[PDB]
Amino acid sequence: AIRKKLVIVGDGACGKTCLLIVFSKDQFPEVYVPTVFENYVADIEVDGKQVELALWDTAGQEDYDRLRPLSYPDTDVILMCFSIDSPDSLENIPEKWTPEVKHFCPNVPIILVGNKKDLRNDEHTRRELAKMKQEPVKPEEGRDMANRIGAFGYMECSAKTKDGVREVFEMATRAALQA
Amino acid sequence: SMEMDEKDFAADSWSLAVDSSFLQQHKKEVMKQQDVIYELIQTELHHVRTLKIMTRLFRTGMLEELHLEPGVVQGLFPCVDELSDIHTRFLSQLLERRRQALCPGSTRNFVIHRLGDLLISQFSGPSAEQMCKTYSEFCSRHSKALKLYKELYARDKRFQQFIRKVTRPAVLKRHGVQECILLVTQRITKYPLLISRILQHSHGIEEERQDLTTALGLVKELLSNVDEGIYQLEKGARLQEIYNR
Ligand SMILES: CN(C)C(=O)c1ccc(F)cc1Br
């Protein structure tokens, strides 16, 4: 099994911590959802290849520009996250997160991930966003941003229901294995 | 970690650690506050364990088994004794607050009502100055430690055999040398997230809400000072590269 490193980046409200927790336990916690994620090494077999995929979160480092880059050395794949219930999290992708990741992780594949996809058709979410002249992120808006930023691909998931979570990490493993 | 503390923090939450008959005596808001305090102590116990792997398994094993050049082990594990002293002392205070709160006849049923004062003490005065000095030094030497590790693993056979030997057990799966270094660098930025969530469930006693608000501010001040005090050291960097920063 070859060792690969994955780092997830995105705004504080993007759901990156929850996504790593749900994947690493293969379960949305029924009693207590942890506030933080330390690290994890997942055993993944994708397209017949066995990989040990180390997972890291950047939560808590968003305001600290000299501490945050210490998470990037030798990263093999980046998950760049935004929440579908937050068009503001999607607007910060191209000129804040993307230039930083391209600088510290040159030539590393980026997968743009739309989290909380279950909220796209949530009535409470649609009412709250409409007060700021907003609506949940549409799939084409996500794909277009991924295309513009030079992402390897665009994917969506819901940590709450687990839908799409396995597929995101299997694809990240395939991206980490490419030349 | 020692078995007594591992068993006390084996459960995924405070609500699963205490007896169900004790859990049922508390209101939902108390259970939510205690679950987050339990996560702060449990993650602190694991952080002190990461530092013990670095000092006892790696650092001391390299000194006792290998023939490394002088200054190489200090380069791989900068400030680890100072970091161990800071966090073992903090963990001791957290565990003593829990132990004093136990019900007589129980080794698992407790409620911690007064964490804020302990956090203000940790993140103020000389202990905060030592945390700031130690993390500014450690985090500035982080890139250099990773590069030194990679060079030794690729070129020294006895070093590669030593690493493969001591990291083979399944309990070391997440704790290779580079993984330990990044776990330590990331620890300090977990504190505001944990403290803010404890504060969210600590409004019942106004003195406690005020104390956690003060602690959160002190932790953010420490992080801002550490972040401003970092500049990565590079082996063989020339003075001209430094003054042209
Ligand atoms: C001076 N120095 C080591 C860097 O700027 C750096 C480079 C790459 C990386 F992934 C993280 C960092 Br921090």
Give the 3-state secondary structure of B177-218: HHHHHHHHHHHCCCHHHHHHHHHHCCCCCHHHHHHHHHHHHH
| Residue B98 contacts A where some CB pair is shorter than 8 Å | no
State the nearest Cα–Cα gap between A31 and chain B, in angstroms. Answer: 8
Name which residue sits closest to atom 6 of ligand 1, judged by CA: A104
Indicate the length of chain B as a whole number.
245
Q: What is the secondary structure of B56-124 as a DSSP string?
A: IIIIHHHHHH--PPTTHHHHHSTTHHHHHHHHHHHHHHHHHHHHHTSPTT-SS------HHHHHHHHTS
Q: Which distant-in-sequence residues (6+ apart) come within 8 Å of A145 by Cβ?
A: A82, A90, A93, A94, A112, A154
Distance (Å, rounded) from C-alpha B50 to C-alpha B25? 36
Which parts of chain A are beta strand (E)? 2-10, 40-46, 49-57, 77-83, 110-115, 153-156
- Closest in A39, A57, A63 to B179, CB measured: A39
Cβ distance B230 to A66 less than 8 Å, yes or no, reads yes
Distance A104 CA to ligand 1 centre (A): 6
Distance from CA of B46 to the nearest CA of A (A): 9
Interval between CA B191 and ligand 1 midpoint (Å): 24
B143 lines ligand 1 (CB under 6 A): yes
- H/E stretch holding B29: helix B28-52
| Pure H helices in A71-131 | 87-91, 98-104, 123-130
DSSP label at residue B55: I
Question: Chain A contact for B35, CB < 8 A?
Answer: yes
Which two tokens mark A45?
């077999």
Q: Which residues contact A141 (CB under 8 A, 6 or more apart)?
A: A87, A90
Both tokens of residue A9? 């980046």
Its domain, for residue B5, covers 1-245
Q: Which residue has the tokens 């809400």?
A: B209
Which chain A residues touch B if contact means CB-CB below 8 Å?
29, 31-32, 34-36, 38-41, 54, 56-57, 59-61, 63-67, 70-71, 73-74
CA B42 to chain centre: 10
Rounded CA-CA distance A9/A97 in Å is 8
Q: Resolution in Å, one decimal, please.
A: 1.5
Q: What is the CATH number of domain A3-177?
A: 3.40.50.300
Q: Which residues does chain A have within 8 Å of residue B31's beta carbon, measured at their own beta carbons?
A: none
Best of A6, A27, A65, A67 to substitute, by most chain B Cβ atoms within 10 angstroms, is A67
Ligand 1 centre and the CA of A14: distance in Å? 25
| C-beta of residue B38 within 8 angstroms of C-beta of residue B9 | yes
CA distance to partner chain B, nearest, from residue A59 (Å): 8
B182 → closest Cβ in A34, A41, A71: A71
Binding residues of A: 10-17, 28-35, 57-61, 115-118, 158-160
Of A31, A40, A65, the CB nearest to B16: A31
Burial class (CB in 10 A: 0-12, 13-18, 19+), B100: exposed
How far apart are the CA of A73 and the centre of ligand 1, in A? 7
Task: Inspect the interface and report whether the beta carbons of A60 and B192 lie closer than 8 Å.
Answer: yes
* Count of CA atoms in the C-beta half-sphere (13 A) of B195: 27
Provide the β-strand partners of residue A9: A80
Tokens for B68, please give them.
């490394």
Sheet of strand A49-57, all strands in order from the earlier edge strand to the far edge = A40-46, A49-57, A2-10, A77-83, A110-115, A153-156
What is the tally of structural domains in chain B?
1
Sort out which chain A residues have CB atoms less than 8 A from B230's CB and list them.
Answer: 66-67
What residues of A are designated binding site for GTP? 10-17, 28-35, 57-61, 115-118, 158-160
Q: How many residues does chain A have?
A: 179
Beta bridge partners of A44: A51
Orientation angle between helical segments A165-177 and A16-25, nearest 10 degrees: 90
Q: Which residues contact A160 (CB under 8 A, 6 or more apart)?
A: A28, A116, A118
In sequence order, the 6+-apart residues with CB closer than 8 A to the CB of B234 are: B143, B144, B241
User: How crowded is residue A95: how many other Cβ atoms within 10 Å of its Cβ?
Assistant: 10
Please report the sign of the dihedral spanned by the C-alpha atoms of residue B185, residue B188, residue B189, residue B194.
positive
Q: What is the dihedral of CA B224, A91, A7, A33, to 10 degrees?
A: 80
What token pair was written down for A155? 């994917």
SS3 A50: strand
Domain ranges of chain A: 3-177
**Shortest alpha-carbon distance between residue A154 and chain B (Å):** 28
Question: Which residue, A146, A125, A124, is CA-closest to A136?
Answer: A125
Q: Is A76 helix (H, G, I), strand (E, B) or coil?
A: coil
Q: Does B182 touch chain A (CB under 8 A)?
A: yes
Sign of CA dihedral B1, B7, B9, B12: positive
Of ligand 1's atoms, which has the minimum distance to the CA of residue A74? 10
Distances (CA, A) of B53 to B126, B171, B180, B199: 27, 11, 8, 32
Quick check: B139 contacting A, CB < 8 Å? yes
With contacts defined as CB-CB under 8 Å, which chain B residues touch A53? none
- How far, in whole angstroms, is CA A133 from its chain's centroid? 26
Is beta strand A2-10 parallel, antiparallel or unpaired with respect to A77-83? parallel
Chain position carrying tokens 């929850």: A18
